[PDB]
Scaffold this active site. Structure first.
Site, mmCIF file in Angstrom:
data_model
loop_
_atom_site.group_PDB
_atom_site.id
_atom_site.type_symbol
_atom_site.label_atom_id
_atom_site.label_comp_id
_atom_site.label_asym_id
_atom_site.label_seq_id
_atom_site.Cartn_x
_atom_site.Cartn_y
_atom_site.Cartn_z
ATOM 1 N N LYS A 5 47.821 45.080 36.822
ATOM 2 C CA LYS A 5 48.984 45.522 36.489
ATOM 3 C C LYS A 5 49.571 46.279 38.013
ATOM 4 O O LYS A 5 48.740 46.926 38.478
ATOM 5 C CB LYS A 5 49.102 46.554 35.418
ATOM 6 C CG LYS A 5 50.235 47.628 35.958
ATOM 7 C CD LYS A 5 50.194 48.684 34.466
ATOM 8 C CE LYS A 5 49.111 50.023 35.129
ATOM 9 N NZ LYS A 5 49.073 50.922 33.955
ATOM 10 N N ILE A 6 50.741 45.906 38.401
ATOM 11 C CA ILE A 6 51.085 46.338 39.702
ATOM 12 C C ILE A 6 52.379 47.102 39.561
ATOM 13 O O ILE A 6 53.264 46.441 38.819
ATOM 14 C CB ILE A 6 51.311 45.279 40.851
ATOM 15 C CG1 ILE A 6 50.089 44.206 40.748
ATOM 16 C CG2 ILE A 6 51.617 45.761 42.127
ATOM 17 C CD1 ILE A 6 49.852 43.165 41.904
#
Length: 44
Positions: A5-6
RNA sequence: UGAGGGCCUUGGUCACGGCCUUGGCUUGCUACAAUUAACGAUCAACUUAGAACUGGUACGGACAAGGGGAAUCUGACUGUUAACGAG
Protein backbone atom coordinates in the site's frame (compact mmCIF):
# COMPACT_ATOMS: atom_id res chain seq x y z
CA UNK A 1 4.02 -11.65 -5.38
CA UNK A 2 4.56 -8.37 -3.52
CA UNK A 3 1.36 -6.57 -2.47
CA UNK A 4 1.89 -3.19 -0.83
CA UNK A 5 0.00 0.00 0.00
CA UNK A 6 1.43 3.35 -1.11
CA UNK A 7 0.29 6.85 -0.22
CA UNK A 8 0.07 8.65 -3.55
CA UNK A 9 2.52 11.56 -3.67
CA UNK A 10 5.32 13.02 -5.79
CA UNK A 11 7.45 9.93 -4.99
CA UNK A 12 4.90 7.37 -6.22
CA UNK A 13 6.28 6.79 -9.73
CA UNK A 14 9.78 5.89 -8.50
CA UNK A 15 8.41 3.01 -6.43
CA UNK A 16 6.46 1.79 -9.47
CA UNK A 17 9.63 1.96 -11.59
CA UNK A 18 11.60 -0.03 -9.01
CA UNK A 19 8.82 -2.63 -8.79
CA UNK A 20 8.83 -2.91 -12.58
CA UNK A 21 12.59 -3.45 -12.36
CA UNK A 22 12.15 -6.32 -9.89
CA UNK A 23 8.82 -7.74 -11.13
CA UNK A 24 7.48 -8.93 -14.46
CA UNK A 25 4.05 -7.26 -14.05
CA UNK A 26 3.32 -4.36 -11.69
CA UNK A 27 -0.19 -2.95 -11.40
CA UNK A 28 -2.00 -0.71 -8.92
CA UNK A 29 -5.66 -0.55 -7.91
CA UNK A 30 -8.06 0.75 -5.27
CA UNK A 31 -10.42 -1.86 -3.82
CA UNK A 32 -13.90 -0.63 -2.87
CA UNK A 33 -13.20 -1.45 0.79
CA UNK A 34 -10.70 1.42 0.86
CA UNK A 35 -12.56 4.71 1.20
CA UNK A 36 -12.45 6.98 -1.84
CA UNK A 37 -11.33 10.00 0.19
CA UNK A 38 -8.16 8.16 1.25
CA UNK A 39 -5.06 8.56 -0.91
CA UNK A 40 -3.88 4.99 -0.32
CA UNK A 41 -3.45 2.78 -3.39
CA UNK A 42 -2.76 -0.98 -3.32
CA UNK A 43 -0.16 -2.03 -5.90
CA UNK A 44 0.65 -5.68 -6.59
C1' U B 1 0.16 45.42 -149.48
C1' G B 2 -5.38 47.03 -149.33
C1' A B 3 -9.24 50.73 -146.76
C1' G B 4 -10.84 55.25 -144.23
C1' G B 5 -9.19 60.65 -142.57
C1' G B 6 -5.70 65.29 -143.04
C1' C B 7 -2.61 68.89 -145.87
C1' C B 8 -1.95 69.52 -152.04
C1' U B 9 -3.13 70.18 -156.78
C1' U B 10 -5.26 69.70 -161.90
C1' G B 11 -9.73 70.62 -165.61
C1' G B 12 -15.06 71.29 -166.56
C1' U B 13 -18.98 73.52 -164.21
C1' C B 14 -22.65 76.93 -161.51
C1' A B 15 -22.50 83.89 -158.37
C1' C B 16 -14.19 83.73 -151.57
C1' G B 17 -18.43 79.22 -151.94
C1' G B 18 -20.98 74.63 -154.13
C1' C B 19 -21.27 70.32 -157.98
C1' C B 20 -18.41 66.17 -161.22
C1' U B 21 -13.43 64.14 -161.99
C1' U B 22 -7.76 63.57 -162.12
C1' G B 23 -2.30 61.79 -159.43
C1' G B 24 1.10 61.58 -152.86
C1' C B 25 -3.56 59.57 -137.77
C1' U B 26 -7.21 55.09 -137.18
C1' U B 27 -7.82 50.26 -139.21
C1' G B 28 -7.93 45.42 -142.28
C1' C B 29 -5.20 41.09 -144.52
C1' U B 30 -0.32 38.55 -144.94
C1' A B 31 5.67 37.64 -143.68
C1' C B 32 10.01 37.04 -139.40
C1' A B 33 10.66 37.58 -134.01
C1' A B 34 7.92 37.39 -128.25
C1' U B 35 5.32 33.92 -125.68
C1' U B 36 8.70 33.96 -117.46
C1' A B 37 2.20 39.55 -119.84
C1' A B 38 5.48 35.09 -113.89
C1' C B 39 4.91 42.47 -116.62
C1' G B 40 2.59 47.15 -116.59
C1' A B 41 -1.43 50.74 -116.45
C1' U B 42 -6.14 52.44 -114.80
C1' C B 43 -10.89 52.68 -112.17
C1' A B 44 -12.80 51.38 -107.63
C1' A B 45 -12.56 49.85 -101.97
C1' C B 46 -9.56 50.56 -96.69
C1' U B 47 -8.65 52.36 -91.49
C1' U B 48 -5.28 51.21 -84.65
C1' A B 49 -10.34 45.46 -80.47
C1' G B 50 -9.05 46.29 -76.82
C1' A B 51 -11.26 46.67 -71.61
C1' A B 52 -10.81 45.99 -66.02
C1' C B 53 -6.94 46.87 -61.61
C1' U B 54 -9.88 41.43 -58.41
C1' G B 55 -7.85 38.67 -55.22
C1' G B 56 -6.39 34.18 -52.97
C1' U B 57 -1.15 31.89 -52.65
C1' A B 58 3.26 29.69 -50.52
C1' C B 59 6.72 32.33 -47.11
C1' G B 60 8.88 35.55 -42.99
C1' G B 61 6.63 37.62 -37.54
C1' A B 62 2.28 38.31 -32.86
C1' C B 63 -3.50 37.14 -31.69
C1' A B 64 -6.71 33.67 -32.08
C1' A B 65 -13.01 31.16 -27.82
C1' G B 66 -9.29 28.87 -22.84
C1' G B 67 -5.88 26.79 -15.98
C1' G B 68 -3.21 22.22 -17.09
C1' G B 69 -1.08 16.75 -15.94
C1' A B 70 -1.10 11.49 -14.31
C1' A B 71 -3.26 7.21 -12.37
C1' U B 72 -7.26 4.23 -10.36
C1' C B 73 -12.89 2.88 -9.64
C1' U B 74 -16.76 2.69 -12.96
C1' G B 75 -20.46 2.44 -18.19
C1' A B 76 -21.11 0.68 -23.32
C1' C B 77 -16.75 -2.40 -25.33
C1' U B 78 -11.13 -3.10 -30.63
C1' G B 79 -6.95 -5.04 -32.73
C1' U B 80 -1.05 -1.89 -25.52
C1' U B 81 0.16 1.59 -19.34
C1' A B 82 -5.39 -0.13 -26.14
C1' A B 83 -8.76 3.61 -27.02
C1' C B 84 -13.80 6.11 -25.61
C1' G B 85 -17.08 9.00 -21.59
C1' A B 86 -17.03 17.16 -21.08
C1' G B 87 -19.07 9.64 -15.17
Amino acid sequence: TFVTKIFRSKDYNKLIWVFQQLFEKVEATKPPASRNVSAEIFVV
